[PDB]
Design an enzyme around this catalytic site. Sequence first.
Site, mmCIF file in Angstrom:
data_model
loop_
_atom_site.group_PDB
_atom_site.id
_atom_site.type_symbol
_atom_site.label_atom_id
_atom_site.label_comp_id
_atom_site.label_asym_id
_atom_site.label_seq_id
_atom_site.Cartn_x
_atom_site.Cartn_y
_atom_site.Cartn_z
ATOM 1 N N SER A 1 0.861 -1.173 0.000
ATOM 2 C CA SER A 1 0.000 0.000 0.000
ATOM 3 C C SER A 1 0.900 1.226 0.000
ATOM 4 C CB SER A 1 -0.931 0.008 1.212
ATOM 5 O OG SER A 1 -2.044 0.849 0.993
ATOM 6 N N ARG A 2 0.687 2.132 -0.956
ATOM 7 C CA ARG A 2 1.650 3.211 -1.135
ATOM 8 C C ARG A 2 1.163 4.524 -0.539
ATOM 9 N NH1 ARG A 2 3.591 2.018 -6.365
ATOM 10 N NH2 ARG A 2 1.415 2.300 -7.041
ATOM 11 N N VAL A 3 0.069 4.500 0.220
ATOM 12 C CA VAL A 3 -0.151 5.600 1.152
ATOM 13 C C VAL A 3 0.636 5.346 2.427
ATOM 14 C CG1 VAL A 3 -2.421 5.880 0.126
ATOM 15 C CG2 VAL A 3 -2.204 4.742 2.337
#
Lengths: 98, 70, 52, 55, 504
Positions: E366-368
């Site tokens: 997850s790139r948040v």
Amino acid sequence: RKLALKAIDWVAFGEIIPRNQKAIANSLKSWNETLSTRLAALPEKPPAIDWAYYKATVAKAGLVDDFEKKFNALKVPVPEDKYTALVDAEEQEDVKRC
Amino acid sequence: VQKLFVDKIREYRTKRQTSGGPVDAGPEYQQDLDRELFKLKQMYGKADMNTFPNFTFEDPKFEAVEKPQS
Amino acid sequence: SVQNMMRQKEQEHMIRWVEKHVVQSISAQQEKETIAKCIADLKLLAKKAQAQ
Amino acid sequence: SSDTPEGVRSGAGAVRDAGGAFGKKEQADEERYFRARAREQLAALKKHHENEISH
Amino acid sequence: EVSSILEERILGADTSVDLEETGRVLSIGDGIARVHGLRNVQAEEMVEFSSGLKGMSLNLEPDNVGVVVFGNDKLIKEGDIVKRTGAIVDVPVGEELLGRVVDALGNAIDGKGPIGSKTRRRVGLKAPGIIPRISVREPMQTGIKAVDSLVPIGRGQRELIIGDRQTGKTSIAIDTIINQKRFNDGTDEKKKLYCIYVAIGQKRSTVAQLVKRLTDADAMKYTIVVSATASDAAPLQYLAPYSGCSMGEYFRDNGKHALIIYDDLSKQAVAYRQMSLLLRRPPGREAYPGDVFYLHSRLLERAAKMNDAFGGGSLTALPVIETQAGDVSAYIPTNVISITDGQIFLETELFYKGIRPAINVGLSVSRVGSAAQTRAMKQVAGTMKLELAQYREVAAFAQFGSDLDAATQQLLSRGVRLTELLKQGQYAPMAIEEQVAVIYAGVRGYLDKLEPSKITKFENAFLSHVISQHQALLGKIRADGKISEETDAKLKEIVTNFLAGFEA
Ligand SMILES: Nc1ncnc2c1ncn2[C@@H]1O[C@H](COP(=O)(O)OP(=O)(O)OP(=O)(O)O)[C@@H](O)[C@H]1O
Ligand SMILES: [Mg+2]
């Protein structure tokens, strides 16, 4: 409704020390955790009975209202407290022996 | 189209004049919804039309045991 | 659940009678056809004045 | 390849599904070992005393 | 009074005459009509035939116009009359749809009654630009102990649920609808969530089983379900993803929050390929047209986190994608991977080895990042993510390992017991304050002497204890948000009191 408090079930109440009977004291704390959640499942007050909408939506009259007239003025007798005193009776004899 | 409109209103009022109920249904709609509700009331529950329920419950017998200390 | 379910059974059986009974009643109204042409064009006389 | 979700990665039970040399060497070793265990468990199953009285 | 309401409708009906811009039919076949005439139709404009079906004109050619059919073509004969409506496709939208079952065009299929929605909205709108957006910070709570610990989801992130057939992809997105009941009956207006569920090409009996699952948990009073099933026509499975974002953008435009689930997007690229190759468009890789990337990009880019000058709304999108034999390097599994942010990869091998939900945390990202976790969950799970990642390095030594170092025996000992905390039964979503307590019991070291088979029985015993007997501690992590030094000591004797007398 009615609801009374209790004492701390922390150190003494699970260390009753029978003849290696730590299992009976462990079962004593297991009933307090089960009944407190069953008391947390249902509230003190139940839902309210709307009477006016019952007459129009169930407007085939007579058989609908006669059950609603008999079940409205009913009473719910709770169970007896005969075993409530004898279990509290043996606490009075053992405290004189302790 | 209003003269076509009141022609519809006439045939709704002759459908209002009923004395035997379903004229075009016959036994087909009578055997259906009688068997459909009884198949649904078997999933609903066996409750009477005016019998109010009343009962009682038995609580657990709070027994005691013995433990000799002091 | 019995008073409101059975109402929908005769709601559909109401329209099941009418739409098969309209076409057998308007098939002989050829005396109404001579005014049906005479009422159509006056709406067209009302309609062709809109774009003009 | 395998150091990303895109590339091919191997699962469990991939030597037998290939069916090569190691896939055949594994089937004949599970059988030649569990053949002797059908000997020792059947020879000691004849040592029921009630059957010998019937004999 | 059944006769009165029927007489009421027909006098309230509008019987007025109009003009039209009609055109005859040339050749109907396989669901593609060719119409001669209609000289002033826009692209993608809804027309309607003489029988009653509706049609959307996709090809504006010189001598004819190619119009797909919203139905079946056995009612369309050559030589019919194709009238014009004069408007692009629009859906009803509002608050009145909450708790209904709708098809791809906003009609009611559940038979309760017609929608009373007063507003109307197009399906072909654009995304907001760069200026009306802001970075994602609020948490979206799923209720799965492995999602909120290692692969979190913020309120505006797009997260892909990818995996094979029959591995719990629908079940992960069906308790996320159930878990938001605890906020949706309370008072805090900026913590409520609204869920929409789009079924694209499933059988009618499956949708009839899933509405009853959401009726049982009292979670169909804030949920809408848009059903374009398998029997319905090929273009109705194309509009139905774009008929749900238009109902999830009314809650984003008015300061509220939302959630949408596409189940599934790999059956929209197939229902669109059939429409292309029957309209004679140039094919490409795996007979998909040249613009299947442009089909999925302008649907997922409509999910955005708005800022305070526009209302502060949000829209969260969870698409489901079915791979074949675990090959994500196909055409459509690589389009939707490069659009969204992170994936949740459910394997089939871990499903039968006992790990349920079978989330692989080796390939899920997850790139948040950690900027969508609360302060309580962030503190304990930052070490758990490092602890589990050291275990997956040494998982291949477990089958024959006893002659190893005591650090390596410890790394195996914590990795097995952290795994048992991650398993979870179906339709049991937890709270974040109860989630952080169970992780705190494991990551500190309070479980390395308990037997690995008892970690499930210990957890169900410990959770029912702290709900009734320590309720005033799980109100000072829910309202505080962080875990202080006072609560660090107060939680410390709790898991030492329970572990002391436990086995009974
Ligand atoms: N956490 C869980 N624990 C145990 N079983 C589960 C769990 N989640 C789902 N299942 C079971 O897995 C089965 C299939 O799951 P599900 O239908 O969600 O998978 P799916 O891949 O979405 O299905 P489809 O392939 O049809 O899309 C169901 O019967 C369900 O009971
Ligand atoms: Mg599924």
